[PDB]
Amino acid sequence: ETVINAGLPPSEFWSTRIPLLRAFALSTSQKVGPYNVLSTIKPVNK
Amino acid sequence: ASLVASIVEARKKRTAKKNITPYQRGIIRSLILTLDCSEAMLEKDLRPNRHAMIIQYAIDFVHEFFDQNPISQMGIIIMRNGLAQLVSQVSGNPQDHIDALKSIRKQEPKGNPSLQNALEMARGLLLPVPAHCTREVLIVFGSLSTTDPGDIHQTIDSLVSEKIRVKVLGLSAQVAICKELCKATNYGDESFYKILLDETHLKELFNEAVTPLPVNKINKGFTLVKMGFPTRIFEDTPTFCSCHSKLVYGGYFCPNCHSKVCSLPTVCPCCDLMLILSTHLARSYHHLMPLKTFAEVPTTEKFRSEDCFSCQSRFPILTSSRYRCEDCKQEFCVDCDVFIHEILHNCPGCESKPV
Amino acid sequence: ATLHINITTASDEVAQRELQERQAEEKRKQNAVPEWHKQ
Ligand SMILES: [Zn+2]
Ligand SMILES: [Zn+2]
Ligand SMILES: [Zn+2]
Ligand SMILES: [Zn+2]
């Protein structure tokens, strides 16, 4: 409603929503730490 | 000696409360609550389990935190599957945080914890915080190990650079990194790492964190903050709120742009001006002029009256069951002393005494 | 011996949760107490 038809610039719209952008990026920007992966693998005739 | 043992224990407890100096405390705060939800929290040491009890006390802590710090902000983070998950943004609404905590109560904790991921997320949430607010993180750690993708030491240095403060509440025993994180971040103090010894101690630890943290002398951030005191209005017809865009019968009116808000204290969604009431500021006056502790009066000297000055309770006839205030020199009963320094924050004798 | 591997895709994990819920429901219905024992 505000950026497509009204004409508000995209840059100004995100100026007041910096924390929203940062929170969304941190969700997919973090990784788990190293750990022995093959030790946890248990094969558990087939 | 059994009764004497209790009294000396009370005296020892009062000893820590005798040294009450008017320390400069940061009333405006910005807290990040990092809770641990990992495999280590599935133990049964805390009935029913660590996850359930911590969440329940967290909800109570949220209620107390905003009641005594109405102009502060809080955020909540959880450590799950080796990653930091955000469940509540920094905001002054106590209901949003409670709602997030209740939802977390259902999901089972699993995976490994990661202090670095939680701390890195905290560093980001606190980045858009004014310089007059105290950036604080209250981590509730439950594991004895930390799996991180990078160097935790680098993050600790970064936190010190941003003037962030960390409080860690462990569960089982001391952890070397947590001690360093709390020590290198609190200007060398080692009293910010607390390990509970039972459920009762846990309740006290959360309740202790509610009070504002005294600031350091070399950390100066003095300034003037532009605030506003709106006037409540009573409208016959519902009107659209400027914060949630819904129909609400009432709401406050901002004095800078006349835009209405639903609840206080919150920053105006139009002029970004903090809106508060005189009561919100009055709630924190007792943190700037703490009442001087009452000293037990020895039985050797004579007393003024047989009954309490405030509650008119007959003093029980060894030890004098009277507490006197040096400012006004009026005896008080043991019951009044507790209520005058915890619920009330003004000595009735001092107010009654003319000057 | 024979080694059979099963790669679990994100969609497969969602399906596994649905199957677990359906399996729990099926077991619950079979375990319903008879009428004479309810009242
Ligand atoms: Zn609203
Ligand atoms: Zn305004
Ligand atoms: Zn009394
Ligand atoms: Zn007094």
From Swiss-Prot, chain A:
It is found in: Nucleus. It comes from the Eukaryota. Component of the general transcription and DNA repair factor IIH (TFIIH) core complex, which is involved in general and transcription-coupled nucleotide excision repair (NER) of damaged DNA and, when complexed to TFIIK, in RNA transcription by RNA polymerase II. In NER, TFIIH acts by opening DNA around the lesion to allow the excision of the damaged oligonucleotide and its replacement by a new DNA fragment. In transcription, TFIIH has an essential role in transcription initiation. Component of the 7-subunit TFIIH core complex composed of XPB/SSL2, XPD/RAD3, SSL1, TFB1, TFB2, TFB4 and TFB5, which is active in NER. The core complex associates with the 3-subunit CTD-kinase module TFIIK composed of CCL1, KIN28 and TFB3 to form the 10-subunit holoenzyme (holo-TFIIH) active in transcription. An additionnal subunit, TFB6, plays a role in the dissociation of the SSL2 helicase from TFIIH after transcription initiation. TFB1 interacts with XPC/RAD4. XPC/RAD4 recruits TFIIH to the NER machinery. Interacts with the NER 3'-endonuclease XPG/RAD2. Present with 5150 molecules/cell in log phase SD medium. Belongs to the TFB1 family. This is General transcription and DNA repair factor IIH subunit TFB1. It comes from Saccharomyces cerevisiae (strain ATCC 204508 / S288c). The chain holds residues 197 to 246 of 642 of the full protein.
Swiss-Prot record, chain B:
It is found in: Nucleus. Present with 2340 molecules/cell in log phase SD medium. The chain holds residues 96 to 459 of 461 of the full protein. The gene is SSL1. Keywords: DNA damage, DNA repair, Metal-binding, Nucleus, Transcription, Transcription regulation, Zinc, Zinc-finger. This is General transcription and DNA repair factor IIH subunit SSL1. Component of the general transcription and DNA repair factor IIH (TFIIH) core complex, which is involved in general and transcription-coupled nucleotide excision repair (NER) of damaged DNA and, when complexed to TFIIK, in RNA transcription by RNA polymerase II. In NER, TFIIH acts by opening DNA around the lesion to allow the excision of the damaged oligonucleotide and its replacement by a new DNA fragment. In transcription, TFIIH has an essential role in transcription initiation. The keyword Mitochondrion does not apply. One of its GO terms (molecular function) is zinc ion binding. One of its GO terms (cellular component) is nucleotide-excision repair factor 3 complex. Disulfide bonds: none annotated. It comes from Saccharomyces cerevisiae (strain ATCC 204508 / S288c). Residues 30-209 form the VWFA domain. GO terms for biological process: nucleotide-excision repair; regulation of transcription by RNA polymerase II; transcription by RNA polymerase II; transcription initiation at RNA polymerase II promoter. Transmembrane segments: none annotated.
Curated annotation (Swiss-Prot), chain C:
Residues 17-29 have a biased composition (Basic and acidic residues). Residues 17-38 are annotated as: Disordered. It comes from the Eukaryota. It is found in: Nucleus. TFIIE is a tetramer of two alpha (TFA1) and two beta (TFA2) subunits. Present with 35900 molecules/cell in log phase SD medium. Recruits TFIIH to the initiation complex and stimulates the RNA polymerase II C-terminal domain kinase and DNA-dependent ATPase activities of TFIIH. Both TFIIH and TFIIE are required for promoter clearance by RNA polymerase. Belongs to the TFIIE alpha subunit family. This is Transcription initiation factor IIE subunit alpha. It comes from Saccharomyces cerevisiae (strain ATCC 204508 / S288c) (Baker's yeast). The chain holds residues 258 to 296 of 482 of the full protein.
